[PDB]
Design a protein around this ligand. Structure first.
Ligand code: ADP
Ligand code: ADP
Ligand code: ADP
Ligand code: MG
Ligand code: MG
Ligand code: MG
Lengths: 370, 156, 370, 370
């Protein structure tokens, strides 16, 4: 059977094609000790990966090999893949085809080096690099629709009609969960909670996942937070200290719809989705409007689907029917689509084989993969 | 008054300043906001020419581009009691605004201007033109009570 | 029974001889995907024909195999015919004599190829190629009259008296609906509406079909449009956008009477019909004047019959009685006439049989048919 | 003296009739601050126009009032014209007739509004709106030839013979320098270079103007770029970073001949020019083949003239003599022609005077101007 590894900027979703959910879901981090040890027999491991790094983060410097969907530390990415295959899936990669994923409009060298590592370091019999938005549509089961994929590093739109992608209409926006996490750190300093250091970036990520939500009307939410104090919620840190968070709950996700507040000139995800649709042929826009598929962790905020429906409806002509599709498993929709695609009989000729690779080199990935 | 008047939808979005610039110490909230409303009120080319020319004169007088003309109108409206023609023009324009197909979005922009740029800091003492435009977007006039603010100190 | 296939430049009207209306009516277009990929297992095809091409028009490039009555892409025309017989009529062409139609003054290779394909590719037992103008007379039930047939490709006049055609008086203008659609596309840019793709040409065709009309007095209508908006109508595009069209409603069909609008040095349809009648014998002009019969979709514009009555009446001597016969089913009059002709017992010995073809070759069509 | 203001999509070329080059050439952009505050006396100026906006580009959000040869932001366009008259030319518009240009097949409201502004906002004594393609012929000094004008917003060709234009043969493509600029920043991501802001789009435009060229044979150039590094060129960004581009140098201009690169269904400029010639009368085609005159900045790519020579020669019959005229002053051909036209004594009766506008209103432009 084939392996499906959705690398992702924040989390590694790995498993076997044909399963309904990934076997392993662990952070895509590598931690190096900061302090002096200092006992005999302790701390002989120079690095920690995934959940082990998260558990020991107190005495570690955590670093993400993937930033904005682009792998920036290939030695660490090799560690993560080695951890995924041998310690999480417990498989010999030489026996299983591996389906990988990446965002559109990525550097070509990223996927060229992905192919090289897989065939040489891990010696997989074959592999394939799929576009994450396309897989999300596979998971949804549709053949038409515009996918809004928003993970930790990249938010990108891919309009697809009858199985045909319109690449000129693909929009990519380097504003995703990690940027929201950094903004939440920044606005948390408005109160006395000064994480303001790389040690506790994960704690505020947990705060963001637990408490943050998208306001249907930002102005009304801001007024309610200023007036009542009924939106205040408390979070307990690992130290046992309790932080109270008010309007920062919905101000942090508001950066998605107002890329300002972090100094970005781009438009919000609602306008990026609308702009993507308007770049498509006028004849497919009605079907795209009714098939707004949302995927990725950053789309898991409560009320984001309702907010997206309201915002796009305000941009599109009134006669159009706007419909946001937000499956409960949209956090794993990309991996689910990869699993569906990897197990199709018609797909078994789309693999990049080892024989093809060493005959053509890493450039083979550009010919055989979208 | 203006039958068949149509507007190009989303034409005004490009004119909304960034929230970061709304906090500039020399930001002109009134002129910038009125620029958004002027752009939003630009007649669509599909409107019949007689209505376009008729309406363009109305918004040109009430929402001029020139700062000199805008300031002159502002002063002339301080004693609006002696200018019935402006009263009729402002009333006519406000009627158009309240029927704008995207009044809801323009209301959100107006509230953002008040929230960030202090557009309605004068509250009830807002000038006639700006107050009427806001009343068109916000019918109830609740904006006269300025935006609610957090008041971080002494928090529970 | 016999098949009647009136495959004009724009539409394919097909059915069985003796029926009162064609069974299959669909556009004469072949669409091919112009976008990329991307989903495997989808029911994708390398080309779409007819209604399916229109449905998926958003992601296709549409080609008409016939332009100005001449088949220019015979491979596409073959799959158009294959679509008609097998997917629309659901018949075996091997056991049905098939009657085809074409415009007068067409290239002889067009008829020869039509005959060759029917006998060698579709192996029809027999076939015949009729003239569209003649068939319209069969539908009208007359044997005398001058027929003005205007479809998507060509406009031609054929005067017939007591069943006798005067071929030297036959007129043919390569100015028809498609030229009107292109002109409407051009003058719609005056209002800021831009349609450039083949898919959007169909939208402009729909606008022309359900909004354009012929002005009885062009100058009066222009003044009326310039003075008021009473002539302006709104049309909703597939994406919910609304376009308002004013004097373009009648300026587009006005090209039929003023070909100089599209840079053609030619006389309008009214003058071509008059010029045809004047080329006829003086003794039959009176009957021709009273039996002007319209056929084809391009004659469906509201007010065209009244305009033609006014225009010819201004050309002909005041004592002549000009009568324009514009049946409500003049769009299908050609097919109806073909159905009548193919069901006549006296016509059964005029089919080109397979035995005749294999003895004489494709050139038999020139002797057996008009 | 008369003012000639060639208000193109990208650049404003303004000057006095009779001069050999425009006096003022500055970008057609209005930039407004997008950052905060924060110093007393340093933020009173809202909006910057032209070169000042380009210099302060880093803190502004740049916007073009003209898109695809169509003025979309009339408040910004008024600022641009005010900057031209008072700050760049230092003239009183009420004392000088103003000749300005626009692309053919533009919306009529575009001419009407610009006529309205010139007479009512600037009180110009008289004005005229000329077609840019026609002016290029004036600059070249010919009276016959098919002009190919390609600037920042729109590319069009107007066939003219013996001083007569064939309006049915005009071509217009919304594919010009700005579309090439946007494509270049899209394919620059393949090398890991991310330009997303309006400020950075200007840098990508500079990269295009400095490094991009047209390959005589695209496929061979792609093979050469793949096989060797001889085509790579380095460019220093404003902050000192150095970027190197290989096949992107000629892939970006290739979109002119292969519009499908950016998802457009239209044909290349070479085929559009041939189509325009084929729409002209057969007797004048030979003269047009020998008088293809290029104008506009988008025709300044090295090797564009040779590529157009090659492409048209492969379309035209072998016995024709294809000649491409690409004067070094291509970029200012339109303004030079306008200066020639404005200073002609026989042209002084063709102005739209203020008195004419008063009686007839903005609609006078449609009668007095082609
Ligand atoms: N329930 C949730 N609410 C809000 N944000 C979430 C939630 N779950 C995950 N996220 C965010 O989504 C990101 C991970 O999403 P994911 O789709 O795994 O991205 P990637 O595919 O790049 O790993 C994290 O940065 C996290 O902050
Ligand atoms: N109601 C209508 N009004 C105006 N034009 C029409 C109408 N119906 C059809 N047409 C035009 O007529 C053409 C089709 O006519 P048709 O007789 O089917 O031609 P053909 O014989 O070549 O198929 C189309 O190009 C269409 O634009
Ligand atoms: N040397 C050059 N090489 C390639 N492109 C150029 C060059 N100079 C200008 N351009 C392009 O031409 C455009 C400007 O052309 P111009 O004729 O000024 O158009 P407009 O009349 O719309 O201002 C710009 O978008 C620029 O990208
Ligand atoms: Mg992901
Ligand atoms: Mg017909
Ligand atoms: Mg130009």
């Amino acid at each position: 059977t084939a392996l499906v590894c959705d690398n992702g900027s924040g989390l590694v979703k790995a498993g076997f094609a044909g399963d309904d959910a990934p076997r392993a879901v662990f952070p895509s981090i590598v931690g190096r000790p900061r302090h002096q040890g200092v006992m005999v027999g302790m701390g002989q491991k120079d690095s920690y990966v995934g959940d082990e790094a998260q558990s020991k983060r107190g005495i570690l410097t955590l670093k993400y090999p993937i930033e904005h969907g682009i792998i920036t530390n290939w030695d660490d990415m090799e560690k993560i893949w080695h951890h995924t295959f041998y310690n999480e899936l417990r498989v010999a990669p030489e026996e299983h085809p591996t389906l990988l994923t990446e965002a559109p409009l990525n550097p070509k060298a990223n996927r060229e080096k992905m192919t090289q590592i897989m065939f040489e370091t891990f010696n997989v019999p074959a592999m394939y690099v799929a576009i994450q938005a396309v897989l999300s549509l596979y998971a949804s089961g549709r053949t038409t629709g515009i996918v809004l994929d928003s993970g930790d590093g990249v938010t990108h739109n891919v309009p697809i009609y009858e199985g045909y992608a319109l690449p000129h209409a693909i929009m990519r926006l380097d504003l995703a969960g990690r940027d929201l996490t950094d903004y939440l750190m920044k606005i948390l300093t408005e109160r006395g909670y000064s994480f303001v250091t790389t040690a506790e970036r994960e704690i505020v990520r947990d705060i963001k996942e637990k408490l943050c939500y998208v306001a249907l009307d930002f102005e009304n939410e801001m007024a309610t937070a200023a007036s009542s104090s009924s939106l205040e919620k408390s979070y307990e840190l690992p130290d046992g200290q309790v932080i109270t968070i008010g309007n920062e709950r919905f101000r942090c996700p508001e950066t998605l719809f107002q890329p300002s507040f972090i100094g970005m000139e781009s438009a919000g995800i609602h306008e990026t989705t609308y702009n993507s649709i308007m770049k498509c042929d006028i004849d497919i826009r009605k079907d795209l409007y009714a098939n707004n598929v949302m995927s990725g962790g950053t789309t898991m905020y409560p009320g984001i689907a309702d907010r997206m429906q309201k915002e796009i409806t305000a941009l599109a002509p009134s006669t159009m029917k706007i419909k946001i599709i937000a499956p409960p498993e949209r956090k794993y929709s990309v991996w689910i689509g990869g699993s569906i695609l990897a197990s199709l009989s018609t797909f078994q000729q789309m693999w990049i084989t080892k024989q093809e690779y060493d005959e053509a080199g890493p450039s083979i990935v550009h010919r055989k993969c979208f | 008054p203006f039958s068949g008047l149509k507007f190009k939808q989303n034409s005004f979005l490009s004119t909304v300043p960034s929230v970061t610039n709304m906090h500039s110490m020399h930001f002109d909230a009134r002129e910038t906001f009125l620029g958004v409303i002027r752009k939003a009120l630009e007649p669509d080319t599909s409107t019949p020419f007689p209505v376009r020319r008729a309406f363009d004169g109305l918004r040109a007088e009430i929402l001029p581009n020139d700062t000199i003309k805008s300031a002159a109108l502002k002063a002339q409206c301080s004693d609006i009691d002696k200018h019935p023609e402006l009263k009729a023009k402002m009333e006519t324009l406000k009627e158009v605004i309240t029927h704008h197909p995207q009044k809801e979005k323009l209301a959100e922009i107006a509230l953002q201007f008040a929230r960030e740029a202090g557009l309605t800091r004068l509250k009830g003492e807002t000038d006639y033109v700006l107050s009427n435009v806001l009343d068109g977007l916000i019918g109830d006039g609740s904006w006269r009570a300025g935006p609610a603010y957090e008041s971080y100190l002494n928090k529970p």
